[PDB]
């Protein structure tokens, strides 16, 4: 969930009015790169879970977390517009 939130914040932050300028270019680039990496992490861990125990992975995706106003990881992923996470077979299996 933290990797998805991090990916969304870095991706939205890299295309923002506060980061435009001739001298700020390379860091901005860095942000996008970092965003992708976090996205990869978010997919990757999930994949590992689906390899180990599909049912326990399903139980983890359905868990409501108190820190983000009591809703699950798929809701966060949809809010973060993570197309890669939503298209994964494990996530699709829990939605179905």
């Amino acid at each position: 969930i933290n990797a998805l939130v991090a990916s969304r914040i870095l991706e939205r932050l890299s295309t923002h009015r506060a980061l435009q300028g001739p001298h700020l270019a390379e860091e901005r680039a860095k942000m996008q790169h970092n965003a992708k990496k976090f996205e990869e992490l978010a997919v990757g861990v999930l994949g590992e879970c689906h390899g180990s125990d599909s049912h326990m992975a399903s139980e983890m995706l359905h868990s409501k977390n108190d820190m983000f106003n009591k809703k699950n990881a798929i809701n966060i992923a949809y809010d973060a517009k993570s197309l890669a996470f939503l298209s994964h077979p494990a996530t699709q299996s829990v939605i179905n």
Binding site: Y78, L83, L86, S87, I95, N96
Partner: protein, 145 residues
């Protein structure tokens, strides 16, 4: 309610993508349809006052001739050609150009434009099939919610 199905749903998303190619085909055909229609209607009836019937005559037969329904018997009756061969022994020689214009028109519309639409669909389909599948997978949760 077809969107919930794994076969019909992505195909619906692909149809919404191909609508721009459909619009491209409509803009290209509109040119040939109004050009041929005004020319053919004027050629068939060169001594008639403009009315609403003139406007329908410009769009009615030109549009339906691109689907294979060729009104050649009706065109033969309207041209006042009394010969057994279709456009011989006519009152005016200019109306004998009516099948030639038509001959160009269906070459432009059926052989050229329809086949280019087939080519555009195949290219567009190959380009946006994976994106349509991913978008359907996001809409699966949206429909569940």
């Amino acid at each position: 309610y077809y969107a919930l199905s794994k076969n019909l749903g992505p195909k619906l998303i692909m149809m919404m993508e191909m609508m721009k190619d459909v619009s491209t085909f409509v803009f290209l055909l509109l040119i040939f349809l109004i050009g041929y229609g005004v020319a053919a209607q004027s050629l068939l009836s060169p001594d008639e006052d403009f009315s609403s019937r003139t406007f329908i005559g410009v769009l009615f037969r030109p549009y339906f001739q691109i689907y294979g329904e060729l009104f050649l018997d009706d065109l033969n009756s309207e041209a006042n050609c009394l010969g057994d061969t279709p456009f011989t022994e006519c009152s005016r020689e200019t109306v004998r150009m009516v099948p030639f214009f038509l001959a160009v028109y269906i070459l432009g519309s059926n052989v050229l434009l329809v086949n280019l639409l087939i080519a555009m669909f195949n290219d567009t389909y190959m380009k946006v099939q994976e994106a349509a599948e991913d978008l359907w997978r996001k809409q699966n949760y949206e429909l569940c919610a």
